[PDB]
């Protein structure tokens, strides 16, 4: 068929970085030396596709730090759709710090950011991109994705989280 352009995004193809087989690692769990700046480690992040967008990539400018959640953030997720913008989609695993019926368990989550409005190739991309960023993200602890920057809600996520079995987003602040 028309194979001839291999811009592997057109039809949903990029090829992961390998960073994202440390993004869903960077907020695994109490995976910190020492979690005082382990959390300046950054581990929440939005990638987005490489150059000319393909690769799964933290490429645009967003990434949380997990421990700033409480300086510019608060320990809500809000904050980090604020790096979710409409202008741009992209996977994105942010350190997670909520309790649960299991209590305080630090579960990133799986973001596909996409914005109803961003450009059909990063939302027809991700259609099949989600498939070689799980090849890296194992466990993506909540594959959840946003098309608006409500569907991060923390009352939702306190769905994706409190929908299941968790205290805190769905139980004591949501």
Request: proline share 5%; with cysteine; aromatic share 8%.
């Amino acid at each position: 068929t028309m194979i001839t352009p291999s811009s592997g995004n057109s039809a949903s193809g990029v090829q992961v970085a390998d960073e994202v087989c440390r993004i869903f690692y960077d907020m695994k769990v109490r995976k910190c030396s020492t979690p005082e700046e382990i959390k300046k480690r950054k581990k929440a992040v939005i990638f987005c596709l490489s150059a000319d967008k393909k690769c799964i990539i933290v490429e645009e400018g967003k990434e949380i730090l997990v421990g700033d959640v409480g300086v510019t953030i608060t320990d809500p997720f809000k904050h980090f759709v604020g790096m979710l913008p409409e202008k741009d989609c992209r996977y994105a695993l942010y350190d997670a710090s909520f309790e649960t019926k299991e209590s305080r368990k630090e579960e990133l989550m799986f973001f596909l950011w996409a914005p109803e409005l961003a450009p059909l190739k990063s939302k027809m991309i991700y259609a099949s991109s989600k498939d070689a960023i799980k090849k890296k993200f194992q466990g993506i602890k909540h594959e959840c994705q946003a098309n608006g920057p409500e569907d991060l809600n923390r009352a939702c996520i306190a769905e994706k989280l409190g929908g299941s079995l968790i205290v805190a987003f769905e139980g004591c602040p949501v």
